[PDB]
Amino acid sequence: ICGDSTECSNLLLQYGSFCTQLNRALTGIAVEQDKNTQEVFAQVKQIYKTPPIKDFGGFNFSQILPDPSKPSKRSFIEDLLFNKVTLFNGLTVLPPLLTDEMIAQYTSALLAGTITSGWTFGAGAALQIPFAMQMAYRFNGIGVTQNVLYENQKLIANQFNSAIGKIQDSL
Amino acid sequence: EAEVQIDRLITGRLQSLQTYVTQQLIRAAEIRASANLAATKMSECVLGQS
Amino acid sequence: GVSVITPGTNTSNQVAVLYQDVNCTEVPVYSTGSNVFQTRAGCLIGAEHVNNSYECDIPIGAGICASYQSIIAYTMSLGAENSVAYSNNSIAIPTNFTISVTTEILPVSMTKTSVDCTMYICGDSTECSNLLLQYGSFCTQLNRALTGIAVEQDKNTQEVFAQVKQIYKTPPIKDFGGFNFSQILPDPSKPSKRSFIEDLLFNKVTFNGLTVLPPLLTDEMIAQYTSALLAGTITSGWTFGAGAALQIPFAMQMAYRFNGIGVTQNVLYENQKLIANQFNSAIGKIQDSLSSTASALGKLQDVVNQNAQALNTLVKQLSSNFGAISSVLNDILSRLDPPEAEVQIDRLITGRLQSLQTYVTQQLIRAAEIRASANLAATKMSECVLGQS
Amino acid sequence: AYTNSFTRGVYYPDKVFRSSVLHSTQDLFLPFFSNVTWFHAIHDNPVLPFNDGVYFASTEKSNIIRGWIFGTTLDSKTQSLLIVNNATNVVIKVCEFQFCNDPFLGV
Amino acid sequence: NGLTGTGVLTESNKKFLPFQQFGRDIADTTDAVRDPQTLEILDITPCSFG
Amino acid sequence: AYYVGYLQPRTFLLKYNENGTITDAVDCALDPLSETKCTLKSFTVEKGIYQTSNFRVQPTESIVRFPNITNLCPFGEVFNATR
Numbered sequence: 001i002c003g004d005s006t007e008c009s010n011l012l013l014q015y016g017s018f019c020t021q022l023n024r025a026l027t028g029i030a031v032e033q034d035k036n037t038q039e040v041f042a043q044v045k046q047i048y049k050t051p052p053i054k055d056f057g058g059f060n061f062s063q064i065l066p067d068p069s070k071p072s073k074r075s076f077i078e079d080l081l082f083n084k085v086t087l088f089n090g091l092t093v094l095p096p097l098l099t100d101e102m103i104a105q106y107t108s109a110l111l112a113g114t115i116t117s118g119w120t121f122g123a124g125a126a127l128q129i130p131f132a133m134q135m136a137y138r139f140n141g142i143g144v145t146q147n148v149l150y151e152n153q154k155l156i157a158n159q160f161n162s163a164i165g166k167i168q169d170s171l
Numbered sequence: 172e173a174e175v176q177i178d179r180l181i182t183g184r185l186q187s188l189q190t191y192v193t194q195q196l197i198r199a200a201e202i203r204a205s206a207n208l209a210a211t212k213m214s215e216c217v218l219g220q221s
Numbered sequence: 222g223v224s225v226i227t228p229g230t231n232t233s234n235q236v237a238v239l240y241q242d243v244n245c246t247e248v249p250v251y252s253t254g255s256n257v258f259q260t261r262a263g264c265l266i267g268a269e270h271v272n273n274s275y276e277c278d279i280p281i282g283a284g285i286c287a288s289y290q291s292i293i294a295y296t297m298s299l300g301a302e303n304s305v306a307y308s309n310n311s312i313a314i315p316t317n318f319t320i321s322v323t324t325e326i327l328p329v330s331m332t333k334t335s336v337d338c339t340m341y342i343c344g345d346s347t348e349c350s351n352l353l354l355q356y357g358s359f360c361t362q363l364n365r366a367l368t369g370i371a372v373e374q375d376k377n378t379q380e381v382f383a384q385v386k387q388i389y390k391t392p393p394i395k396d397f398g399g400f401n402f403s404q405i406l407p408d409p410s411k412p413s414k415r416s417f418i419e420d421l422l423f424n425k426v427t428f429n430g431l432t433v434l435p436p437l438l439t440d441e442m443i444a445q446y447t448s449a450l451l452a453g454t455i456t457s458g459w460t461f462g463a464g465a466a467l468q469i470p471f472a473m474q475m476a477y478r479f480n481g482i483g484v485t486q487n488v489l490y491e492n493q494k495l496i497a498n499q500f501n502s503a504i505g506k507i508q509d510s511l512s513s514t515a516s517a518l519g520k521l522q523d524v525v526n527q528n529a530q531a532l533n534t535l536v537k538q539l540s541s542n543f544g545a546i547s548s549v550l551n552d553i554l555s556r557l558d559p560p561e562a563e564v565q566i567d568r569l570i571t572g573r574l575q576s577l578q579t580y581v582t583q584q585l586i587r588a589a590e591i592r593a594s595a596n597l598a599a600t601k602m603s604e605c606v607l608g609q610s
Numbered sequence: 611a612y613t614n615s616f617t618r619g620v621y622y623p624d625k626v627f628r629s630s631v632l633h634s635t636q637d638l639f640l641p642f643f644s645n646v647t648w649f650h651a652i653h654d655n656p657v658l659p660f661n662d663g664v665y666f667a668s669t670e671k672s673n674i675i676r677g678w679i680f681g682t683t684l685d686s687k688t689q690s691l692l693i694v695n696n697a698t699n700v701v702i703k704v705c706e707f708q709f710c711n712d713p714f715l716g717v
Numbered sequence: 718n719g720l721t722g723t724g725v726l727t728e729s730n731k732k733f734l735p736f737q738q739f740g741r742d743i744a745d746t747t748d749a750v751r752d753p754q755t756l757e758i759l760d761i762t763p764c765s766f767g
Numbered sequence: 768a769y770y771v772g773y774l775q776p777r778t779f780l781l782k783y784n785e786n787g788t789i790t791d792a793v794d795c796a797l798d799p800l801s802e803t804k805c806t807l808k809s810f811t812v813e814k815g816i817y818q819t820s821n822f823r824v825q826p827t828e829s830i831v832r833f834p835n836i837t838n839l840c841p842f843g844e845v846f847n848a849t850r
């Protein structure tokens with residue numbers, strides 16, 4: 001409102017103290033954004049890595065696990081999401097506290113934890129379990145007995161792979 | 172009369188700044204509510220079963 | 222802008238200064254200082270650089286942060302690294318268990334306040350009152366919101382605490398299967414009948430036309446509501462939240478609670494003493510955790526400080542000149558000629574009206590946020606206390 | 611010679627009364643950790659500029675330091691204030707005096 | 718002595734140093750004055766309203 | 768032996784006692800810690816990062832440019848006319 005002027009500042013000084021709140025509000029909203037992102041993404045005290053040998057009972061998670069050939073180490077769907085959307089007079093834009101790499105690592109840790117340890121890693125320590133015996137748990141939890149899964153594994157695997165391919169194509 | 176001109180300019184610019192700050196506050200509140208909902212959904216649908 | 226990173230004047234008086242968004246080749250004691258570290262968010266002078274990585278407490282930005290060992294700035298580490306040895310024919314099953322107690326603080330309401338519509342901007346002057354009549358009905362517009370906010374706060378507190386149709390009293394003889402609840406139940410020695418933890422929580426924290434109204438629900442009745450809820454949830458289990466109150470021994474209530482989460486009821490009956498000892502140890506530990514360690518009630522203190530600062534800024538704004546020749550209306554009225562006196566008082570009136578409008582808007586935003594938080598707290602009270610989650 | 615004024619030179623800006631409050635005041639003060647000269651009254655009475663206020667720290671036990679003389683030209687043309695201590699009562703005047711190259715005292 | 722205002726005058730117990738005239742607390746609100754005739758510290762209380 | 772100082776228009780922060788006597792004073796244009804104390808309005812500073820003020824670079828000199836504009840007219844010729 002002054003542009004580095006002397007008499008402008010002298011005239012402005014007599015309007016009392018009002019820019020203090022006009023700056024503290026912006027600081028508060030910046031802190032709110034930082035706290036929001038940290039609270040949403042940070043919910044695990046450790047970082048998990050998928051085993052090098054992957055045989056999850058016929059399921060294929062290649063299009064969802066991080067790709068070890070990119071500088072940013074991001075999965076395929078994250079790359080498509082990033083590529084899909086694309087966008088000085090006393091105002092500035094502050095960089096975020098958490099860069100993209102930390103968010104990608106957090107998501108990869110969550111994905112590996114839920115793939116390997118089931119839901120036991122969200123209530124204490126992580127407990128290993130095969131994937132088929134976890135799908136049996138998840139079917140048994142919705143009223144369908146576990147006898148159905150063990151006799152229809154191939155159909156379920158094929159349907160899951162086709163669905164993930166279809167959603168990849170749609171995105 | 173330069174004083175009067177400066178006063179007019181200052182009051183106009185202050186009004187614009189106040190409007191911008193209020194709009195930003197409203198948008199921040201809505202974004203915070205959405206972020207809280209997203210965090211609850213992630214916690215109750217990723218770490219367990221719904 | 223510039224910023225100062227400090228570890229607190231308690232520990233030491235050594236700071237490091239950071240210049241934001243400046244490729245500080247033209248930096249100008251601290252003209253050069255220690256090693257200059259150019260980062261993605263400006264440049265920092267006063268702290269050295271290290272190649273290690275820990276979890277920090279003073280965030281700087283762009284993924285880097287600094288802490289006091291001198292003062293060192295590094296790149297944060299997300300946490301410890303561990304890989305689970307996944308195999309397709311092996312599982313891990315727990316063989317022991319522990320019982321833990323946590324805490325959670327939720328604000329529900331703030332101080333009810335009101336401001337006089339005309340006393341603030343006139344200061345007992347007849348000319349001010351005469352001139353105010355030409356500015357329309359701003360008085361009711363600026364006065365209705367505060368009453369609405371006060372009513373909302375009262376209803377909010379009433380609906381978040383009042384959830385029992387009766388008042389329950391604990392039996393005089395307390396033999397709860399070995400559990401020790403004497404640190405939670407109200408103490409007859411205290412005249413206010415407040416629990417020891419409540420006493421520690423209470424002791425932990427410490428006119429110009431504006432006033433503060435008293436809340437409807439005093440402290441004693443809130444304490445009585447909490448005691449009734451707690452006695453009901455100890456004696457009747459959770460059936461008192463649906464119909465009448467049905468007595469049940471505590472051991473079988475805990476057996477039902479274990480049966481709810483999957484573990485069979487045999488485990489509790491075979492491991493009662495260990496569970497009782499662990500619960501007693503945890504409830505003892507939380508006492509020292511709450512007593513010795515401060516800064517655990519940041520939310521309430523933040524709300525109180527924000528409200529006090531807003532009120533202080535509003536009351537201090539009254540001393541501004543606002544472009545006139547004096548900050549007091551009476552001297553202008555008694556020293557100057559009317560024809561320009563209308564202009565001076567008009568300037569004062571419009572400035573004060575702008576300040577009042579800003580204060581009202583800020584109060585409305587704060588009230589909305591508090592209402593949302595208290596709704597969440599009420600949902601938590603209804604779900605995680607009167608049953609099982 | 612020069613000496614370090616560590617933290618001296620703080621005075622009550624006003625005549626108001628306050629109790630347990632942090633107050634920020636913008637006024638004329640001697641800066642903290644500053645440089646002050648140091649004269650010697652052995653074998654000094656030089657002319658020193660005023661420059662909008664002055665400090666004075668005299669630590670001589672012997673009753674030798676007596677008074678001051680203020681002015682703008684140090685002549686009978688313009689009024690010059692004078693303060694003199696009689697060891698029992700101080701006298702202050704403002705009217706002119708003729709400058710002497712060796713100011714003195716006599717009783 | 719020039720300090721003009723409105724309110725109610727009460728007796729006090731605060732202690733002034735021998736050179737102050739009128740005290741205050743915050744935001745230019747006088748709360749204690751000494752009468753020049755007798756040199757006794759008093760207290761100002763805002764006149765009641767509501 | 769009489770040291771001589773010279774006052775300057777500075778800004779100070781003073782902590783009054785309960786009796787009304789000054790017991791502590793802090794400068795405001797000496798160290799970044801002093802500026803932080805001024806902004807925070809307290810003598811104790813907790814661990815964290817604080818926003819104190821901002822700086823800008825002042826201009827050094829001034830330049831101005833104009834076209835060649837070389838179109839001198841006979842105004843300088845009539846003064847040297849023979850007849």
Ligand SMILES: *[C@@H]1O[C@H](CO)[C@@H](O[C@@H]2O[C@H](CO)[C@@H](O)[C@H](O)[C@H]2NC(C)=O)[C@H](O)[C@H]1NC(C)=O
Nearest residue numbers: 054055056058059060061062063064076161165
């Ligand atoms: C899982 O799906 C991915 C999809 O990208 C497969 O990766 C490619 O799949 C195509 C389709 O047959 C092959 O032509 C490529 O050779 C595959 N690439 C690689 C690097 O293998 C992947 O093979 C699938 N895995 C399983 C076990 O089905």
Ligand SMILES: *[C@@H]1O[C@H](CO)[C@@H](O[C@@H]2O[C@H](CO)[C@@H](O)[C@H](O)[C@H]2NC(C)=O)[C@H](O)[C@H]1NC(C)=O
Nearest residue numbers: 051127128303304305306307308311312313314
């Ligand atoms: C279950 O047994 C397997 C097989 O030995 C364990 O896997 C290894 O255990 C050793 C023992 O400390 C570790 O040093 C290795 O790092 C483990 N292998 C891998 C690839 O991490 C496994 O740790 C055992 N699980 C438990 C809970 O004891």
Ligand SMILES: *[C@@H]1O[C@H](CO)[C@@H](O[C@@H]2O[C@H](CO)[C@@H](O)[C@H](O)[C@H]2NC(C)=O)[C@H](O)[C@H]1NC(C)=O
Nearest residue numbers: 316317318319320492494495496498499500502
């Ligand atoms: C499960 O853990 C508890 C403690 O975490 C074990 O109880 C301890 O037992 C040892 C030896 O009997 C005692 O010296 C300790 O004082 C006990 N601690 C407590 C807190 O009571 C218990 O033995 C463990 N369970 C099993 C099956 O070993």
Ligand SMILES: *[C@@H]1O[C@H](CO)[C@@H](O[C@@H]2O[C@H](CO)[C@@H](O)[C@H](O)[C@H]2NC(C)=O)[C@H](O)[C@H]1NC(C)=O
Nearest residue numbers: 395396397398399400401402403404405501505
């Ligand atoms: C529950 O714990 C409290 C806390 O120790 C016990 O209170 C103690 O009681 C004994 C005798 O009754 C006193 O000598 C102690 O001084 C009390 N402790 C304190 C800190 O004052 C109480 O007895 C325990 N209840 C049960 C049933 O074990």
Ligand SMILES: *[C@@H]1O[C@H](CO)[C@@H](O[C@@H]2O[C@H](CO)[C@@H](O)[C@H](O)[C@H]2NC(C)=O)[C@H](O)[C@H]1NC(C)=O
Nearest residue numbers: 718735736737738751752753754755756757758
């Ligand atoms: C102003 O004059 C009055 C009248 O004499 C003074 O009041 C008296 O002061 C003497 C001082 O020794 C006391 O002994 C009397 O008891 C006082 N009488 C009354 C009725 O107050 C007053 O002190 C004077 N104020 C000054 C000098 O500041």
Ligand SMILES: *[C@@H]1O[C@H](CO)[C@@H](O[C@@H]2O[C@H](CO)[C@@H](O)[C@H](O)[C@H]2NC(C)=O)[C@H](O)[C@H]1NC(C)=O
Nearest residue numbers: 730731732733734735783784785786787788790
């Ligand atoms: C502050 O002023 C008081 C009153 O002049 C001084 O006197 C003290 O007063 C308190 C309150 O009655 C007594 O408890 C002390 O014993 C008094 N001290 C002395 C030396 O008389 C007091 O000294 C002043 N300073 C402080 C720091 O209180």
Ligand SMILES: *[C@@H]1O[C@H](CO)[C@@H](O)[C@H](O)[C@H]1NC(C)=O
Nearest residue numbers: 228229230231232233813814
């Ligand atoms: C203050 O410093 C002391 C001693 O260094 C330390 O014991 C204490 O924990 C510190 N407190 C805070 C709040 O920093």
Ligand SMILES: *[C@@H]1O[C@H](CO)[C@@H](O)[C@H](O)[C@H]1NC(C)=O
Nearest residue numbers: 243244245246247259260261
């Ligand atoms: C900073 O400025 C210097 C020259 O002033 C230049 O050589 C350097 O590349 C700049 N660096 C950045 C990150 O802008």
Ligand SMILES: *[C@@H]1O[C@H](CO)[C@@H](O)[C@H](O)[C@H]1NC(C)=O
Nearest residue numbers: 256269270271272273293295
């Ligand atoms: C940190 O590591 C980089 C690259 O490995 C190296 O160039 C630099 O000298 C190291 N600095 C320290 C302080 O170890």
Ligand SMILES: *[C@@H]1O[C@H](CO)[C@@H](O)[C@H](O)[C@H]1NC(C)=O
Nearest residue numbers: 612613614615643644645646
């Ligand atoms: C100023 O003070 C410093 C330290 O107090 C001293 O070294 C120096 O000689 C003094 N004078 C000048 C002109 O710097």
Ligand SMILES: *[C@@H]1O[C@H](CO)[C@@H](O)[C@H](O)[C@H]1NC(C)=O
Nearest residue numbers: 695696698699700701716717
């Ligand atoms: C100081 O002493 C001198 C010497 O007798 C005398 O002339 C003068 O009047 C005295 N002044 C005062 C104020 O006592």
Ligand SMILES: *[C@@H]1O[C@H](CO)[C@@H](O)[C@H](O)[C@H]1NC(C)=O
Nearest residue numbers: 841842843844845846847848
């Ligand atoms: C006329 O000619 C003389 C001789 O060269 C010169 O000095 C003078 O400047 C000329 N006057 C004008 C107006 O050009």
